[PDB]
Amino acid sequence: QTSPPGWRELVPPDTLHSLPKSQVKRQEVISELLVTEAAHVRMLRVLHDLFFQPMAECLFFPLEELQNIFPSLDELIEVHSLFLDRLMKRRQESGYLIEEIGDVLLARFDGAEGSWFQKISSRFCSRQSFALEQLKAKQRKDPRFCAFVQEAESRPRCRRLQLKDMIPTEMQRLTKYPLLLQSIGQNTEEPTEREKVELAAECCREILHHVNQAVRDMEDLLRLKDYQRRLDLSHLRQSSDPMLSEFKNLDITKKKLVHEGPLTWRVTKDKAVEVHVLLLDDLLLLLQRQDERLLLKSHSRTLTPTPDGKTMLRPVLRLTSAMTREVATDHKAFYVLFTWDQEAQIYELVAQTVSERKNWCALITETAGS
């Protein structure tokens, strides 16, 4: 009733049957734009009003964490909400059919206004996994919270909407914009009006592009905070080994994550160690899962346990000096050779397939020599 009527529902029948096919298609897609945006704002309003802002009062989450689950949603609303008021104005101004939409599209998606929409949008969409993982966990562990969400969901304003389905929506909408603008354009007739829209259609294409990378950017930055938190550096601390003096004091959250994978580390003929490996921008970490913790151990290359003397293999490795080779003896495995001023030692890693060693080798060579 309140959600705006479409177009195809109020256009008078004599107007409809008199227009070019291109033009009814154009009118329809404008209407879809207008309606879906009006549906989008409404939704974001529900998320703020029924979920975010009550949780902030009930403190299920430290506000820091909360604000990180609904990143400046307060402003996401405004950005979308005002863009709609503009759409709504044009429809208002022009009854029957709307010619000219381009200038609205640019007022939201261009230059400065374009950047601001991007920035707010980026904030929200990028923490999407986190918000989901965090919400799902709490709701599955704290029954006060689940009662909270169900009560929230039973509300009249929350009809047709679900908490778990609302969060990814913003990502999806950015995916629709370039589909809809492109479409309006293909069917715009009047020369100069169309060129606007095509370029509105380009801003969105860039925005989607940007925000998609922004996402792999968080999905990765957090993935490291999470290894930083799980890390145990007590072996590196208690080491007199000089190749490990820099790492005492080790903070991988600032660095770039290039690649990661489970591999098997053959430290001897007779000793293999399951490891989770991080190829950072300049380091190669050999992490051993031990319970909830991630562990950095030097291992002896002397297959006798354990009189001693020789230098041990090391879990953290500077890439500067690296070289990779196929392990002849076992097609699935590979050597990484390091060379420092004192010595040269080699590290044997086994992978799950011929195709996945090839991948590590190329990455290590590509990352190292860079």
Curated annotation (Swiss-Prot):
Compartments in which it is found: Cytoplasm; Membrane
Tissue specificity: Ubiquitously expressed.
Pathological association: Immunodeficiency 62: An autosomal recessive, primary immunologic disorder characterized by recurrent severe respiratory tract infections and bronchiectasis, due to antibody deficiency. Affected individuals have an abnormal B cell immunophenotype, with low levels of circulating memory B cells.
Biological processes, Gene Ontology terms: G protein-coupled receptor signaling pathway; regulation of small GTPase mediated signal transduction; Rho protein signal transduction; Rho-activating G protein-coupled receptor signaling pathway
Function: Seems to play a role in the regulation of RhoA GTPase by guanine nucleotide-binding alpha-12 (GNA12) and alpha-13 (GNA13) subunits. Acts as a GTPase-activating protein (GAP) for GNA12 and GNA13, and as guanine nucleotide exchange factor (GEF) for RhoA GTPase. Activated G alpha 13/GNA13 stimulates the RhoGEF activity through interaction with the RGS-like domain. This GEF activity is inhibited by binding to activated GNA12. Mediates angiotensin-2-induced RhoA activation.
Cellular component, GO, one term: cytoplasm
Domain annotation PH: ranges: 256-369
Recorded name of the encoding gene: ARHGEF1
Main location: cytoplasm
Residue numbers carrying Phosphothreonine: T304
Modification(s) after translation: Phosphorylated by PKCA. Angiotensin-2 induced Tyr-347 phosphorylation is mediated by JAK2.
Domain of life: Eukaryota
Subunit structure: Interacts with RHOA, GNA12 and GNA13. Homooligomerizes through the coiled coil region. May interact with CCPG1. Interacts with CTNNAL1.
Lineage summary: Eukaryota, Metazoa, Chordata, Craniata, Vertebrata
Ranges of residues in domain DH: 25-214
UniProt note: domains: The RGSL domain, also known as rgRGS domain, is necessary but not sufficient for GAP activity.
Keyword Chaperone attached: no
Assigned keywords, A-Z: Coiled coil, Cytoplasm, GTPase activation, Guanine-nucleotide releasing factor, Membrane, Phosphoprotein
Residue numbers of Phosphotyrosine PTMs: Y347
Modified residues (Phosphoserine): S18
Protein name listed in UniProt: Rho guanine nucleotide exchange factor 1
One term of GO molecular function: GTPase activator activity
First-to-last residue of the parent protein present: 395 to 761 of 912
